Amino acid sequence: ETGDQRFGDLVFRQLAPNVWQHTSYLDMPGFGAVASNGLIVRDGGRVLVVDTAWTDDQTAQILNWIKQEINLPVALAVVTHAHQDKMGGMDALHAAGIATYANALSNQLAPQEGMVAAQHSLTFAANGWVEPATAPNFGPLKVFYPGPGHTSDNITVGIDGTDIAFGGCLIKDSKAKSLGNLGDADTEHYAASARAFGAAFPKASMIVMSHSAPDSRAAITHTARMADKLR
Ligand SMILES: [Zn+2]
């Protein structure tokens, strides 16, 4: 109604009464500006964050936006995989005293990827759901590890009480021409891993993704079908 708010170098798009997409950009000569998306979730008297911005500085701006726009404390942040777009503002989260969580494997891979591990490790049961003891007080955040896909550590998040689920860098948009960068990809499991995500949040009608605008469930089926062509 007032459109998408520009704050610092960042853009915020309200997806639901309690949920916002946060967006930061990296201008890569020859590619133009590349968007990275994450979530902000107001749960009662606290805010929960999914992913960082590309950099620590942009991640500090997310925190400033929350303080100024929502004025509630940030209880915790979850990072979807170990890569710059999801994990790049870890130091800013630490400096702010925010409890950080990532897949235990993300935390294992972090040093190699040249990044800072989150404070806490999430572990997942055989059915892919996070062990509740490793994710204390996650509220509406439901964390699912679909298996190896775009990376081996990629996880995914639904928001209880909304129609939203977030597939991270695993799901591409319904018109995407390719699955993009496969260097860390497990190409034989990728398709199953996408369908697993779909089945893990069967009710979500809005799929937020890393690099593009929110899409419908078509994004999941499109991604799965492209990934079928690799196996
Ligand atoms: Zn990635």
Numbering used by the authors: 40 to 270
Task: Copy text verbatim from the article accompanying this structure deposition.
NDM-1 has been reported to be a highly potent carbapenem-hydrolyzing, zinc-dependent MBL. NDM-1 is an extended spectrum zinc dependent β-lactamase capable of hydrolyzing nearly all classes of β-lactams, impairing the ability to treat life-threatening infections with intravenously and orally available carbapenems.. NDM-1 resembles the common β-lactamase fold, although it shows low sequence similarity to β-lactamases deposited in PDB (20–33% sequence identity). Our results show that NDM-1 is unique among other MBLs due to its enlarged and flexible active site, and explain the observed extended spectrum β-lactamase activity.
The structure of mZnNDM-1 Δ36NY was obtained in the presence of 10 mM zinc chloride. The structure contains one zinc atom bound in the active site to the metal site 1 (Zn1) (see below). All four monomers in the asymmetric unit contain zinc atoms bound to the Zn1 site (His120, His122 and His189), therefore confirming NDM-1 as a member of subclass B1 of MBLs and showing that Zn1 is a higher affinity site, as predicted for other MBLs. This zinc atom is shifted approximately 0.8 Å as compared with the di-zinc NDM-1 structure and shows somewhat longer Zn-His distances. The metal bound structure is very similar to apo structures (for example, rmsd between Cα atoms of apoNDM-1 Δ38 comparing 218 residues of chain B of mZnNDM-1 Δ36NY is 0.46 Å). In the mZnNDM-1 Δ36NY structures, there are several water molecules near the zinc atom. It seems that there are three distinct states of the NDM-1: metal free, singly metalated and doubly metalated. All these states could be targeted for structure-based inhibitor design.
